[PDB]
């Protein structure tokens, strides 16, 4: 029979977004594991050879009670065997189908466990973009287990994500529109419908016609049944908000009264049961000492108004001319300043200048965006003896000055 | 040191013959369409060939070799870097003068345009979004002086510097 | 005792807030604009960046705003041309940068603040060359306050101020209730103190005039009339004190709660007797 490192492979548990997953059983003890199989040739045929490396390096360091643990990964001349935790409960999707809906007493607990897993990912700069009841597994004691990352990705500082991925449902409006997104707010949107599916037993946005389905999602209009109380209803409307800036965050959800009730204190980092260590708790519980508040006793060093109207900061620089004219303009602007640069995109330059005083190289990233209708915006981003932040500002200043 | 031998073709019964079996027939296990067998092979080259429904055959999508007599068998090269995951992912893997996506709404959240409540140190700011970092924000030029600003990260802290620079 | 070993352990990085704002002025910037920018950005002081030599050269504080006014102020009938015309670069000619690494100890910070007799210390990362934060006495003491229950009680905290002899109790620089602002600025320059107790004819402290109350002249643009009384200048906001028998801990708690830099040591009534400053406290908790 088929043996892979003391484990006998069995029936296919299913096929994920990338790879075949089949149960394994220990030859000596009968211990069950789940083995995802990745074909090295199909990995190298695509440009995902470096994408798999990242996922392995990140899934191996994960240790959350509600995320499928990775035990080890075996390497063969043709295939990769990722041996990971097995759970016999099956999908959550099949659970919502067995029962009619889910009792809010139990639905809340499952939602608390899921969101705990999501938050852990976001704190490790990982965004799981394929959140769905089919990807939430159950064990013998009804504990949620997030799995099948595949479409997941990392989050860099000052970087947006492009890929439109995931199921047609459960997908944020920005994802189905092919727009740039931050990451975390997308997962919250999937958790919103998951909760809806958990409570209602159906989907908030559903249609046989796919173009009509996208219309409903972008519209952000869904039916809220009367058996859903006032409290939980306000939470769903917050999580499924179309405009990602108005959409709730995990901190928002954690402050919601429907979410706080019957909430175990071991699930979240700053809850009493979660926790040098003593030093951080002293510093963390001093929020007003490390972070600013938002609109008592006026701070002694508060400045009076100079009353003149306060000036408003804006993102980079703008224009109302042709996109080609702007790029043609910024190109001749780099000539007068002697800038060396590589072209990544028709609207994405990676420029670089050598500092004549320190000798160090100063590089930054340029990106032209589209605002409103007849508007454009040039974005300035920094790239990692004097001072790097000053180098970035001085380099930007010279380019802005010699640019109309 | 396991090695996977998978038969993707059709058949009711598939056997595996190679130098390891002294060219004897090893019964393969069937799933739905897959006939596979995992063996323990040392480093080097190994000649193998399948046996399907009473007929010798090989995998077309695999390296083959002729033994000067017409017999054609497959070739697999078990390397030492095939048994380490990251060593396997490694082997599997300007200055021109030239020659628009919708602006993401997160970048419109200017951190210097929001009040912080007259109760804390005026130097304090809210915790920034990781996606707005390294981006340049500026003021309108007034009387020859340009003011630039950006939020950068040091360790787990964040600093929003402002540069008043006359042009 | 253990407070000294405490500050030798923690780095300066531990004091830097999670998200803060740092204003920077180029040296070729007009000095009047910079003072206005301190007001509009809510910031008390800013590092100075010399664009030519590509390095930070110093700080611009309200003390500079005092020096400028006092040096060139003829009358309320004539404008201060130099305040209107000078650049930060040019005024630094008429009138060495002291900084500290974020990896440096908290003990080195307090020492550097005292040795150089400064009130605000730039925390500069030697790796990137970037400036991260500006250390002050208030920030340091309020930090130690967060650990007085974690590193429990030395013996002197229970001792009175008269016993510990902490603070200045001789030649206290004060101003009358009707003292002109120009005169007050002259005392700031001559004696180099951060605040001046305002007393009445009876001899009681009716108010206090800190160096911080000077930028209000730049805010309200009333700086061209320094003939007005010190009471008139403090009208826009119209006094924390202590006794000689009160314990050091009570005084430290008094300071960190009010977030001010000094307390006025009074007698039985409201008449002065001395001054206990934050620089006096940090000095006593380092020379032990
Ligand atoms: C979706 C997909 C994922 C992966 C893939 O590549 C591999 N499939 C594999 C199947 C097996 C396999 C085959 C039969 C088996 C077992 C255990 C018992 N039986 C009876 C495992 C193995 Cl040992 C390695 C594989 N590598 C091929 C496909 C595909 O396109 O079909
Ligand atoms: N870190 C520093 N490096 C150099 N000079 C300083 C520093 N801090 C303060 N000064 C000078 O000391 C003056 C008084 O400011 P302060 O120290 O805030 O009372 C300032 O106007 C500066 O000229
Ligand atoms: N109004 C004042 N008159 C005399 N000395 C003072 C006055 N204010 C502060 N001092 C002293 O000046 C030193 C530095 O205080 P500060 O300028 O507040 O850091 C300390 O020794 C204080 O006691
Ligand atoms: N002992 C005190 N009593 C009342 N107000 C004070 C005292 N010390 C400082 N202030 C005020 O606190 C603000 C900041 O001054 P400083 O503490 O010098 O930074 C100014 O408005 C001062 O007038």
Numbering used by the authors:
A (entry chain C): 10 to 284, 327 to 346, 363 to 373, 396 to 473, 532 to 551
B (entry chain D): 78 to 170, 189A, 190A, 191A, 192A, 193A, 194A, 203 to 270
C (entry chain F): 27 to 121, 128 to 270, 276 to 325
Authors' text:
AMP-activated protein kinase (AMPK) plays an important role in regulating energy homeostasis in eukaryotic cells. AMPK is a heterotrimeric enzyme complex composed of a catalytic α-subunit, together with β- and γ-regulatory subunits. The α-subunit contains an N-terminal protein kinase domain and a C-terminal regulatory domain. The γ-subunit contains four copies of a cystathionine-β-synthase domain27, and we previously showed that the γ-subunit binds three molecules of adenine nucleotide.
In our new structure, the CBM is ordered and bound to the N-terminal lobe of the kinase domain. The interface between these two domains generates the binding cavity for 991. One end of the five stranded β-sheet that constitutes the core of the N-terminal domain of the kinase packs against a pair of anti-parallel β-strands from the CBM. 991 sits in a pocket generated at this interface and interacts with hydrophobic residues from each domain, mainly involving ring-1 and ring-2 of the activator. Interestingly, the phosphorylated serine (pSer) at position 108 from the CBM is involved in a network of electrostatic interactions with Lys-31(Kinase) and potentially Thr-21(Kinase) and Asn-111(CBM). Mutations of Lys-29(Kinase)/Lys-31(Kinase), Arg-83(CBM) and Ser-108(CBM) all lead to more than a 25-fold reduction in activator affinity, without altering the regulation of AMPK by AMP. An α-helix immediately C-terminal to the CBM, absent in previous crystal structures of the CBM38 and just outside of the CBM consensus sequence, interacts with the αC helix of the kinase (hereafter, the C-interacting helix). However, the top of the C-helix is rotated away from the active site, relative to our earlier structure, such that the Lys-45->Glu-64 interaction is broken (which is regarded as essential for efficient phosphoryl transfer). Thus, by promoting this CBM/Kinase/regulatory–fragment interaction, 991 and A-769662 enhance protection of the activation loop against dephosphorylation.
